[PDB]
Design a binder for this molecule. Sequence first.
Ligand SMILES: CCCCCCCCO[C@@H]1O[C@H](CO)[C@@H](O)[C@H](O)[C@H]1O
Length: 159
Amino acid sequence: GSHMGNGMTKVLPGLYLGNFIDAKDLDQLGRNKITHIISIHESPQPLLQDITYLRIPVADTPEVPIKKHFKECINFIHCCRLNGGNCLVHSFAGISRSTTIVTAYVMTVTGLGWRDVLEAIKATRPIANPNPGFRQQLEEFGWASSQKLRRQLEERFGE
Ligand SMILES: CCCCCCCCO[C@@H]1O[C@H](CO)[C@@H](O)[C@H](O)[C@H]1O
C-alpha cells in the first residue's frame, strides 16, 4: 500500500515531479504550496488561478530536442525556488519528459552527471525514465551547458 507514488514526488525543497493528474489535483497543489508549474504537453490546457505557468509544447519521442528548452526551464525553476515558491514540472505519464527537465536542473545546481542524478531521482520516484533520445541530450547538456548555466544562475539570481 505504502509505495513512493502518491501524487507529485518531491525532488528537492521547492521542486516536484508529476503527471497530468497531479497537475490538476487542487488538494496536492495546496498541500505542497505549488506556486509555479512547467507544463510539457503537446497542447495548451486550462490554467489554474494563482499559479504561474511555463508552457513547453513537446511530445515524448527520442527525436524531439527538449534540450532547446533546458535553459529557460532551469531559469524558471531557479527563480521560483530562490524567491520562496514551489515548482511542479509535469508531463502526461509522469515518466520521461518532466523527468528530463528536472534532471537537467539538478545536474546544473549539483554539478553531478545525469546518471547519478537520474538514479537519485529514481529513489524517490521509481517510474522515472526519460526516453533514449532525451538521455543522450542529457549527456550533451552535462558536458557542455551544465556548468556554464550554474555560473549564469548565480549571476542572474545570486547564490
Ligand atoms: C498514462 C495513461 C494514458 C492513458 C491513455 C491516454 C491516451 C491519450 O494519450 C496521451 O496523449 C497526450 C497528448 O494529448 C500525450 O502527451 C501522451 O503521451 C499520450 O499518452
